[PDB]
Amino acid sequence: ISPHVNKDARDQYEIRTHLRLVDIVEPTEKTVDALMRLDLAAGVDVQISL
Amino acid sequence: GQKVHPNGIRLGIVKPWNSTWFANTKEFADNLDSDFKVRQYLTKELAKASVSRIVIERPAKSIRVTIHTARPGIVIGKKGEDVEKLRKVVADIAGVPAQINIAEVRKPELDAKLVADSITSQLERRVMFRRAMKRAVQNAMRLGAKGIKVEVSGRLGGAEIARTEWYREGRVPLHTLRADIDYNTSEAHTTYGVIGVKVWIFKGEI
Amino acid sequence: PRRRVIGQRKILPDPKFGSELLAKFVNILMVDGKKSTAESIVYSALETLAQRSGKSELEAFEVALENVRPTVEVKSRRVGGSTYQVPVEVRPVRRNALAMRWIVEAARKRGDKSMALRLANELSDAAENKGTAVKKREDVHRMAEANKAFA
Amino acid sequence: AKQSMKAREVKRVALADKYFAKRAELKAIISDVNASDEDRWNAVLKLQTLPRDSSPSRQRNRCRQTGRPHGFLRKFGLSRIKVREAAMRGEIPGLKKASW
RNA sequence: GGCCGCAAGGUUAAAACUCAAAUGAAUUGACGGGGGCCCGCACAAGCGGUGGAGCAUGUGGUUUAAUUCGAUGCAACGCGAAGAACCUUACCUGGUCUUGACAUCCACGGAAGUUUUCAGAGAUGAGAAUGUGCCUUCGGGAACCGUGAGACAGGUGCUGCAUGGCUGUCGUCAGCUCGUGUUGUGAAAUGUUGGGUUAAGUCCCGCAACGAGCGCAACCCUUAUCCUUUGUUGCCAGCGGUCCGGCCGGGAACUCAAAGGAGACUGCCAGUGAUAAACUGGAGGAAGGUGGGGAUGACGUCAAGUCAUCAUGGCCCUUACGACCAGGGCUACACACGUGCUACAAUGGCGCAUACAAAGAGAAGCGACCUCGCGAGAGCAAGCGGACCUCAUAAAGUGCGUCGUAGUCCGGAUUGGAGUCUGCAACUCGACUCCAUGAAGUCGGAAUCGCUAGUAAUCGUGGAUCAGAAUGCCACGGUGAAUACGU
C-alpha cells in the first residue's frame, strides 16, 4: 500500500463466485421457447445444455 | 495516523458499486480499460454540466450508462440531440450497442463531489479559503444534514510553507459501519502549485 | 504476571500404569513433538530396571525420586549494589519437577550405547544413592547451609 | 514510464502477430524426428534470419494506465497502486476487503 | 589620596571603556541519580536459537570503461524488485538521424502482400503482382503511405527544505477539545479534580458547574452447538441384486454443500459492599463474564519516506541531458555487518513393506493410459472452462534387518567426464540428470533474539510474479510440550 519502501504494510482483497444448478427432465415444445426467450439481470450468467 | 477510505470500507454493507457485470478471466482487463476510456471521455465532455456519478452496466451484448446530474437541460439538449451525439461516440469507443440514461440530483448542497468542485473553482478564481469553507458548511447544515466536515491543504494564500485546515459541524462518526457517509475529493491548480480538498457528509444511520 | 491467575491444565494418565507422575516424566523426556519415541524409551528402561532390582517399576521409580528430591534452595536478591543469596523453602510440585529434570539432564550426558541403557544406569545409581543428580542435590544443600545468616 | 518505452511494446506486438504463422511450424520442424538428415540445417539458419522483435519472449507486461514494469497482476491488467485506487473508488465488480 | 591598625586589613570613595538589555512575582509544559498509585514476554520461572563452519541473499569498502538510481538509530540492510542471459535498462564502447521513436494543423504525390544483393544491425540501393470504398450526384485522399517550412513535440535532468496523493512511528496507548455560566487586572482556571470500580475519560456517588463533539464499546468477517428448506457432479442407515468394486436397481435417514433461523444478556442462586456501581463462588448449557482470531489508527510529533508509478510551481538542455542499433556491465574481490538454509549424529543413517489431511490452480493451459530410456525426459494420445478430468504419492509415524562411537555406512562444499528441457541464442551468466572425487565442521569468546496454548519446537502441501529461473514472500494442515512463587 505504500509507493516506495515499506514491506509490512499490506491490503488483502477477495472475490466470491456463487453457483446454482437446475435440471428439467420431461419438457414440452413451448417450455424451451419460453426459456430461450427469457431475460435476466445484468450481473447473472446463465448456461443451457441439452 | 493514516485513515481508511470511508466508501471502500462500506462497500457491501450500506454502499453499492459503480459498476455491475460478470466476466471470466479472459475479459476482465478489456472491460476495465473500456470503462476507463468511457468515463474519461464523458468527464471531459460534460465538464460544465455538474456531473457527479456515472454508472456502467453490461447486459449480454450491450452497454448501459446512467449519468447523475444537476443540469439536465445542458446534457439532454434541445429536442434530444446532445444525448444522441454522446450515444454515437460511446458506441464507437465501447464497440457494441449502447444506451444512455439521465438522473436528477435534487439538492447539490448535500452532494460531496459537487461541493468539492465548487470550492476548487473558487480557489482557482482567488477567493479567500475561509469564506469558501464557511459558506459550504452553513448551506449544508441549513438544508438538513446531520453533520459535515471540510478540509483544505497546500500553500494557502501563496505562503512559502504549506498548511492544512479544516472545519466541522454536527456528527461525523467514522468508526460506525452502519452510517451513511458520503465522501469525495478534488484538486485546484494555481500559480503556486496544487491544493487539495476533502468533504465528509453525514445523513443518518441505516 | 502482575494481575493474573494461573489455572491447572488437566494431564492424562499413562496407558499401562495409570501414573500421572510417569506422564509428566515422559513429557519432560520428550523432544521435538515426538511422544511415541519417549514412551518406548521410558518403558524399555523401566522394564530393565525392574529386572535388575527385583521390585515393581513404580517402587523403583519412587525410590530413585526420593533419593534426589531437594528441600531448600537459594534465591538471589540485590541490596546496596551487592548480591545476597537468601535461602528459601520449596513446594512439593517444585521438588518433583527439579528431581525429574536433574535426573534427565544427568542421564543425557553419559557415554553408553543407547538412551534406554543410559536411563536404566542413571536410575539404578540414584537408587544406590550415588551419581551426578545426588551430587547436585548435595551442592544445593551446602550452598543453602552456607548462607543461613541471611534468612 | 517514457513514451518511447511505450512505443517499443506496440512494435513488438505487431511484429509477433505478423510472423506468428511463419515461425510456428514451417521453421519449428527442428523437433521433427524423421524430417531429414540436414533439411533442418536450413531451417535453423532461416529461422535466425528473421527479425528479433518477433519472438514472444521479448515482451514485458506493463500497466495499461501508467506503464510501470513492476508489480503486475494478470487478472486486472494494472499495477498494485492503480488496483488499490480503483478498488476503493468502487469500480471493480465483486471486490472488497477480506477477513477470516 | 586622607585617617586608623603590630600585622591580616578596615573606613570615606572615582574615571576612561563596552552592551541593549539586566531584574521581581506569577502562568502552561517538559525534566529530576523527588514522592505516591497502576500497566506491558519489562523482569523473575522455563524451552529453542544467533555470535564459530559451508552455502543463499542484502549492505559498507575497494576495483573498473561502466559496476545505473533510491532506502541507511529503534522506524535502512530476503527493503522499491510478486522473480537482470537478449528484452526489462535507466550505465559504458562503437555505428547513425534532425518537425523527429510518440501527437494536432498546411500543401504536393500515391495505395497494404512475395523475393535477391551490401551492412553487426540500424538503414541505403532492387522486381511483379495490386486496384478498394465514395457522392461517378465528378472528386471528395474520408482510409492509410512518402516528402518539405514551422507552430511545436521530448527529458527515469535538479530541488521530498516550494507541493497534491499515498505510507512509517509514538500506539489499539486512553486520551484530545468546544458552547454557555462562574473566578482572576492578566497569561489562564473550572468542567476532565475527589471516594470506589473497569481492559477502557468503563460506570456509580459527591462537588460552581450545566451540556456536547472526536476517540472507548456495539453495528462487519470467520470459528464451535442445534432447527427448517433443495439433494447433482455429493452421501449409503434399513431392502433386493452382484463379479464383491455405491458397481447395479433404489433411499432422502446420516456426513457434506449455502440460504432463512435459535442461542450468551451478570439473564438465575448465595455471600461482600454506601439503600450504589461492582466483586468471589455454584447450577444448567456446545460455549461464562470483551468464549478464540481478524478488519477498524483520535488532536498531533519526527522540515521522517517517496519529483523514479502518477500529477504539479520554479530552474535547466533542445543537430542534444532528446531517437534507433550490435557487444559489454548491474553477477567484479585483500576485507567488515544483518537476515536465512544445511550439519557437527544412534530420540540416528541406509534397505524392504504398509496407516491417516486441509487448502488451491488449469486454454498459446492442466495433461491421464500405453510403448522406449538406469535417469532428467521422448513418441502416440483420452478427459477437462470443472463437488465429474488433470495437477496428485502427503511426511514425520508403524513392522523386520544392518551399521557399533570411527572424522565413521555421519556431513555434504569443490572439481573432471557424459546428457535433458525452455528459448533465434545458456562463455561471461539458467534449472535439472547419471558416473567419479569427496573439503570445513565433534555444539561455538565478550555480546544478543523469539515465545503464555493448540502457542514454541518439528514434518510435509499450494499460490502470485513467470518461456525458463526460491532457501525469499503470502497461505494450508499432521504430531505436539515446559513454566508463571511474585513486583
Tab-separated table of C-alpha atoms (C1' of nucleotides) in Angstrom, chain E residues 62-384:
chain	number	residue	atom	x	y	z
E	62	U	C1'	37.755	-1.430	-2.727
E	63	U	C1'	38.420	-2.244	-8.155
E	64	U	C1'	36.626	-0.885	-13.279
E	65	A	C1'	35.183	1.735	-19.447
E	66	A	C1'	30.718	1.247	-16.565
E	67	U	C1'	29.798	-1.669	-11.726
E	68	U	C1'	22.587	2.705	-13.255
E	69	C	C1'	19.112	5.175	-9.257
E	70	G	C1'	16.735	5.198	-4.306
E	71	A	C1'	16.202	3.483	1.479
E	72	U	C1'	20.572	3.937	5.541
E	73	G	C1'	19.464	4.776	15.016
E	74	C	C1'	14.716	1.915	17.339
E	75	A	C1'	11.148	3.198	12.442
E	76	A	C1'	17.687	1.053	6.378
E	77	C	C1'	20.235	-3.824	5.289
E	78	G	C1'	15.449	-11.562	1.571
E	79	C	C1'	13.894	-3.184	1.614
E	80	G	C1'	11.264	-0.327	-4.065
E	81	A	C1'	12.347	-5.680	-7.162
E	82	A	C1'	5.227	-10.594	-6.930
E	83	G	C1'	11.357	-13.232	-9.953
E	84	A	C1'	18.706	-8.548	-14.565
E	85	A	C1'	21.271	-14.071	-20.406
E	86	C	C1'	18.855	-10.813	-25.229
E	87	C	C1'	14.367	-7.593	-23.975
E	88	U	C1'	13.447	-5.413	-18.845
E	89	U	C1'	17.646	-0.587	-18.967
E	90	A	C1'	17.508	3.800	-16.680
E	91	C	C1'	25.111	2.721	-17.099
E	92	C	C1'	29.832	2.069	-20.834
E	93	U	C1'	32.347	1.446	-26.059
E	94	G	C1'	31.356	1.978	-31.102
E	95	G	C1'	27.848	2.935	-35.852
E	96	U	C1'	23.947	6.552	-37.172
E	97	C	C1'	19.000	10.990	-37.651
E	98	U	C1'	17.489	16.117	-37.011
E	99	U	C1'	9.382	18.695	-37.281
E	100	G	C1'	11.931	13.863	-35.092
E	101	A	C1'	10.713	6.927	-31.909
E	102	C	C1'	5.306	9.057	-29.689
E	103	A	C1'	0.715	13.938	-31.112
E	104	U	C1'	-2.787	18.393	-33.843
E	105	C	C1'	-2.621	21.818	-38.077
E	106	C	C1'	-0.793	23.095	-44.422
E	107	A	C1'	0.370	21.500	-49.059
E	108	C	C1'	2.039	18.015	-53.118
E	109	G	C1'	2.281	12.902	-54.939
E	110	G	C1'	0.211	7.647	-54.169
E	111	A	C1'	-2.375	2.897	-52.022
E	112	A	C1'	-1.205	-2.508	-47.717
E	113	G	C1'	1.273	-8.703	-49.613
E	114	U	C1'	6.392	-12.089	-52.141
E	115	U	C1'	11.773	-12.053	-53.445
E	116	U	C1'	17.635	-11.096	-54.385
E	117	U	C1'	22.067	-8.206	-53.251
E	118	C	C1'	25.994	-4.643	-49.170
E	119	A	C1'	25.820	-3.909	-43.844
E	120	G	C1'	26.889	-6.482	-36.856
E	121	A	C1'	22.120	-4.116	-37.127
E	122	G	C1'	20.170	0.188	-37.507
E	123	A	C1'	19.337	1.648	-42.632
E	124	U	C1'	20.588	2.543	-48.118
E	125	G	C1'	20.151	0.842	-53.423
E	126	A	C1'	16.345	-3.741	-56.455
E	127	G	C1'	11.447	-6.887	-59.397
E	128	A	C1'	5.919	-8.413	-60.444
E	129	A	C1'	1.715	-8.685	-58.783
E	130	U	C1'	-2.454	-4.831	-56.665
E	131	G	C1'	-6.571	-1.596	-57.827
E	132	U	C1'	-10.807	-0.929	-52.963
E	133	G	C1'	-14.702	2.031	-50.761
E	134	C	C1'	-17.275	7.064	-52.004
E	135	C	C1'	-21.440	11.382	-53.983
E	136	U	C1'	-19.226	8.814	-60.620
E	137	U	C1'	-24.721	13.453	-57.607
E	138	C	C1'	-17.186	14.021	-60.545
E	139	G	C1'	-13.948	14.263	-56.777
E	140	G	C1'	-14.268	14.167	-52.183
E	141	G	C1'	-7.480	11.488	-50.339
E	142	A	C1'	-12.859	10.431	-45.771
E	143	A	C1'	-8.749	5.043	-45.172
E	144	C	C1'	-3.924	4.509	-44.768
E	145	C	C1'	1.949	5.650	-47.240
E	146	G	C1'	6.070	9.226	-48.756
E	147	U	C1'	8.272	14.146	-48.850
E	148	G	C1'	9.054	19.801	-47.330
E	149	A	C1'	8.544	25.061	-43.730
E	150	G	C1'	7.433	25.525	-38.693
E	151	A	C1'	3.955	26.471	-34.534
E	152	C	C1'	5.887	22.544	-31.642
E	153	A	C1'	6.836	17.594	-29.675
E	154	G	C1'	10.673	15.009	-25.969
E	155	G	C1'	13.616	14.702	-20.757
E	156	U	C1'	13.916	7.990	-15.293
E	157	G	C1'	17.606	16.110	-15.784
E	158	C	C1'	17.740	19.449	-10.178
E	159	U	C1'	15.232	20.974	-5.732
E	160	G	C1'	10.666	15.483	-0.650
E	161	C	C1'	13.654	22.399	2.886
E	162	A	C1'	8.302	25.296	-2.632
E	163	U	C1'	3.625	20.982	-3.178
E	164	G	C1'	-1.158	17.078	-4.106
E	165	G	C1'	-1.852	11.894	-3.252
E	166	C	C1'	-0.157	7.619	-0.569
E	167	U	C1'	2.913	5.409	3.886
E	168	G	C1'	6.031	4.511	8.536
E	169	U	C1'	6.356	5.563	14.179
E	170	C	C1'	4.924	7.052	19.382
E	171	G	C1'	0.350	3.394	19.594
E	172	U	C1'	-5.126	-0.190	19.625
E	173	C	C1'	-1.706	3.775	24.369
E	174	A	C1'	-6.682	6.209	26.694
E	175	G	C1'	-6.654	10.224	25.869
E	176	C	C1'	-7.784	15.392	22.931
E	177	U	C1'	-11.161	19.510	22.742
E	178	C	C1'	-15.618	23.077	22.497
E	179	G	C1'	-20.581	26.174	23.862
E	180	U	C1'	-22.879	28.931	27.860
E	181	G	C1'	-22.113	30.101	33.152
E	182	U	C1'	-18.655	31.463	37.075
E	183	U	C1'	-13.233	33.083	39.281
E	184	G	C1'	-8.687	36.174	38.278
E	185	U	C1'	-6.021	43.320	36.311
E	186	G	C1'	-3.913	39.435	33.097
E	187	A	C1'	-1.265	34.911	30.763
E	188	A	C1'	-5.131	31.199	32.358
E	189	A	C1'	-8.628	28.088	35.632
E	190	U	C1'	-13.165	25.098	36.425
E	191	G	C1'	-15.644	21.118	33.937
E	192	U	C1'	-11.571	16.486	32.902
E	193	U	C1'	-10.340	17.211	40.128
E	194	G	C1'	-12.192	13.648	44.904
E	195	G	C1'	-14.225	8.240	47.424
E	196	G	C1'	-14.995	3.294	44.997
E	197	U	C1'	-14.554	0.433	40.469
E	198	U	C1'	-13.086	-1.308	34.941
E	199	A	C1'	-9.485	-3.856	29.667
E	200	A	C1'	-11.183	1.398	28.948
E	201	G	C1'	-12.335	9.770	30.487
E	202	U	C1'	-15.995	1.960	31.641
E	203	C	C1'	-19.731	3.062	35.371
E	204	C	C1'	-21.936	4.892	40.366
E	205	C	C1'	-21.749	8.659	44.174
E	206	G	C1'	-20.104	13.593	45.626
E	207	C	C1'	-18.734	18.817	44.161
E	208	A	C1'	-19.956	26.351	40.525
E	209	A	C1'	-20.829	23.866	37.180
E	210	C	C1'	-24.700	22.608	33.237
E	211	G	C1'	-24.342	20.164	28.470
E	212	A	C1'	-21.995	18.347	23.900
E	213	G	C1'	-18.056	16.585	19.763
E	214	C	C1'	-13.671	13.233	18.084
E	215	G	C1'	-11.755	8.628	20.451
E	216	C	C1'	-13.550	3.533	24.026
E	217	A	C1'	-17.644	-0.297	23.482
E	218	A	C1'	-21.560	-2.095	19.742
E	219	C	C1'	-23.097	-2.312	14.212
E	220	C	C1'	-18.887	-6.119	9.886
E	221	C	C1'	-15.983	-11.204	8.669
E	222	U	C1'	-14.540	-16.098	10.360
E	223	U	C1'	-14.644	-20.371	14.120
E	224	A	C1'	-17.595	-24.220	17.941
E	225	U	C1'	-23.675	-26.281	19.098
E	226	C	C1'	-28.641	-27.124	17.219
E	227	C	C1'	-33.739	-26.464	13.723
E	228	U	C1'	-36.162	-25.735	8.615
E	229	U	C1'	-35.615	-25.746	3.135
E	230	U	C1'	-33.235	-28.212	-2.334
E	231	G	C1'	-30.405	-33.358	-2.893
E	232	U	C1'	-26.119	-33.052	-8.543
E	233	U	C1'	-21.113	-33.898	-10.367
E	234	G	C1'	-22.023	-35.127	-3.448
E	235	C	C1'	-23.923	-39.286	0.687
E	236	C	C1'	-25.126	-45.328	1.579
E	237	A	C1'	-28.670	-46.354	7.839
E	238	G	C1'	-32.675	-50.255	6.555
E	239	C	C1'	-34.484	-53.837	1.130
E	240	G	C1'	-33.150	-56.764	-3.066
E	241	G	C1'	-29.222	-57.959	-6.960
E	242	U	C1'	-23.818	-58.939	-7.590
E	243	C	C1'	-18.218	-60.095	-10.284
E	244	C	C1'	-17.514	-58.398	-4.093
E	245	G	C1'	-15.915	-52.548	-6.915
E	246	G	C1'	-22.088	-47.205	-4.350
E	247	C	C1'	-20.817	-51.476	-9.164
E	248	C	C1'	-26.242	-52.172	-10.005
E	249	G	C1'	-31.901	-51.166	-9.054
E	250	G	C1'	-33.103	-47.814	-5.461
E	251	G	C1'	-33.445	-44.396	-0.491
E	252	A	C1'	-33.660	-38.551	1.350
E	253	A	C1'	-32.141	-41.172	7.160
E	254	C	C1'	-26.705	-39.675	8.446
E	255	U	C1'	-21.670	-36.960	6.784
E	256	C	C1'	-21.494	-32.852	3.461
E	257	A	C1'	-22.886	-28.381	0.331
E	258	A	C1'	-25.094	-22.382	1.087
E	259	A	C1'	-29.663	-19.820	2.056
E	260	G	C1'	-33.622	-18.273	6.237
E	261	G	C1'	-33.387	-19.035	11.670
E	262	A	C1'	-32.354	-20.049	17.621
E	263	G	C1'	-28.692	-19.281	21.118
E	264	A	C1'	-24.881	-15.705	25.849
E	265	C	C1'	-27.980	-10.933	28.419
E	266	U	C1'	-24.288	-10.750	35.004
E	267	G	C1'	-30.267	-13.471	32.481
E	268	C	C1'	-30.668	-17.279	37.889
E	269	C	C1'	-28.987	-18.888	43.391
E	270	A	C1'	-25.656	-17.478	47.760
E	271	G	C1'	-22.023	-14.090	50.128
E	272	U	C1'	-19.182	-8.893	50.457
E	273	G	C1'	-20.275	-3.761	49.572
E	274	A	C1'	-22.755	3.070	50.725
E	275	U	C1'	-30.146	1.517	50.330
E	276	A	C1'	-24.573	2.138	44.840
E	277	A	C1'	-21.848	0.790	40.921
E	278	A	C1'	-19.359	-3.855	41.070
E	279	C	C1'	-16.713	-8.111	43.069
E	280	U	C1'	-15.899	-14.052	44.787
E	281	G	C1'	-18.203	-18.934	44.213
E	282	G	C1'	-22.246	-22.501	42.301
E	283	A	C1'	-26.286	-24.611	38.993
E	284	G	C1'	-27.785	-25.580	33.790
E	285	G	C1'	-25.609	-25.335	28.889
E	286	A	C1'	-21.752	-26.803	22.822
E	287	A	C1'	-19.972	-22.421	24.695
E	288	G	C1'	-19.381	-17.743	31.005
E	289	G	C1'	-18.147	-12.932	32.247
E	290	U	C1'	-14.887	-8.287	25.658
E	291	G	C1'	-15.880	-17.509	24.551
E	292	G	C1'	-10.960	-17.771	20.181
E	293	G	C1'	-8.968	-14.990	15.980
E	294	G	C1'	-9.373	-10.698	12.213
E	295	A	C1'	-10.715	-5.753	9.883
E	296	U	C1'	-11.187	-0.974	12.314
E	297	G	C1'	-5.350	4.007	13.747
E	298	A	C1'	-8.282	10.133	17.800
E	299	C	C1'	-5.878	16.131	18.201
E	300	G	C1'	-0.822	15.754	16.930
E	301	U	C1'	5.221	14.549	16.741
E	302	C	C1'	9.903	13.338	13.751
E	303	A	C1'	11.284	20.238	7.530
E	304	A	C1'	10.591	11.319	8.829
E	305	G	C1'	9.918	8.402	3.107
E	306	U	C1'	8.732	8.927	-1.944
E	307	C	C1'	9.781	14.879	-8.115
E	308	A	C1'	11.763	7.232	-10.401
E	309	U	C1'	4.319	4.668	-10.503
E	310	C	C1'	1.292	9.238	-11.212
E	311	A	C1'	0.324	14.615	-11.015
E	312	U	C1'	2.364	19.541	-10.322
E	313	G	C1'	5.055	25.758	-9.265
E	314	G	C1'	10.222	27.293	-10.198
E	315	C	C1'	15.005	26.252	-12.785
E	316	C	C1'	17.720	23.877	-16.783
E	317	C	C1'	19.003	21.054	-22.433
E	318	U	C1'	16.857	21.171	-27.068
E	319	U	C1'	21.833	18.760	-34.810
E	320	A	C1'	21.218	17.251	-27.590
E	321	C	C1'	20.878	15.934	-20.907
E	322	G	C1'	16.023	14.155	-26.850
E	323	A	C1'	15.555	8.739	-31.004
E	324	C	C1'	17.465	3.922	-33.302
E	325	C	C1'	21.050	-0.398	-33.281
E	326	A	C1'	25.211	-4.622	-32.045
E	327	G	C1'	28.622	-6.006	-27.948
E	328	G	C1'	29.703	-5.340	-22.585
E	329	G	C1'	28.230	-4.125	-17.071
E	330	C	C1'	24.395	-4.172	-12.722
E	331	U	C1'	26.827	-11.431	-11.323
E	332	A	C1'	34.000	-7.744	-10.058
E	333	C	C1'	37.018	-9.364	-4.724
E	334	A	C1'	42.630	-8.462	0.083
E	335	C	C1'	38.437	-7.283	3.628
E	336	A	C1'	33.697	-5.596	7.776
E	337	C	C1'	27.873	-6.323	9.376
E	338	G	C1'	22.395	-8.012	9.007
E	339	U	C1'	18.532	-11.788	7.747
E	340	G	C1'	18.375	-17.233	6.431
E	341	C	C1'	19.240	-22.890	4.820
E	342	U	C1'	22.435	-27.466	5.921
E	343	A	C1'	25.364	-30.021	9.599
E	344	C	C1'	28.748	-31.418	13.534
E	345	A	C1'	24.697	-37.947	14.503
E	346	A	C1'	22.372	-43.687	17.500
E	347	U	C1'	15.469	-39.658	20.066
E	348	G	C1'	20.143	-41.663	14.194
E	349	G	C1'	21.887	-43.192	8.648
E	350	C	C1'	20.773	-46.976	4.632
E	351	G	C1'	17.086	-51.276	2.578
E	352	C	C1'	12.222	-53.754	2.119
E	353	A	C1'	6.768	-53.341	3.320
E	354	U	C1'	2.386	-50.530	4.911
E	355	A	C1'	-1.996	-46.092	8.251
E	356	C	C1'	-4.088	-41.121	8.496
E	357	A	C1'	-5.150	-34.346	5.780
E	358	A	C1'	-6.508	-29.305	4.666
E	359	A	C1'	-6.469	-25.526	1.344
E	360	G	C1'	-5.648	-24.099	-4.078
E	361	A	C1'	-4.800	-23.767	-9.891
E	362	G	C1'	-5.989	-25.074	-15.284
E	363	A	C1'	-6.988	-22.531	-22.715
E	364	A	C1'	-0.799	-20.135	-26.583
E	365	G	C1'	-3.478	-24.184	-20.314
E	366	C	C1'	-3.538	-28.796	-16.833
E	367	G	C1'	-2.287	-33.260	-19.386
E	368	A	C1'	-4.089	-39.408	-17.807
E	369	C	C1'	-3.433	-44.867	-20.047
E	370	C	C1'	0.274	-47.433	-23.371
E	371	U	C1'	5.400	-48.086	-25.503
E	372	C	C1'	11.115	-46.628	-25.178
E	373	G	C1'	15.205	-44.935	-21.715
E	374	C	C1'	19.204	-46.770	-15.321
E	375	G	C1'	17.609	-41.224	-15.013
E	376	A	C1'	16.182	-35.920	-16.058
E	377	G	C1'	12.836	-36.968	-20.443
E	378	A	C1'	10.756	-38.610	-25.686
E	379	G	C1'	6.515	-40.630	-29.179
E	380	C	C1'	1.421	-41.572	-29.804
E	381	A	C1'	-2.778	-39.761	-27.305
E	382	A	C1'	-8.378	-39.679	-23.665
E	383	G	C1'	-10.810	-36.090	-20.335
E	384	C	C1'	-11.454	-31.133	-18.580
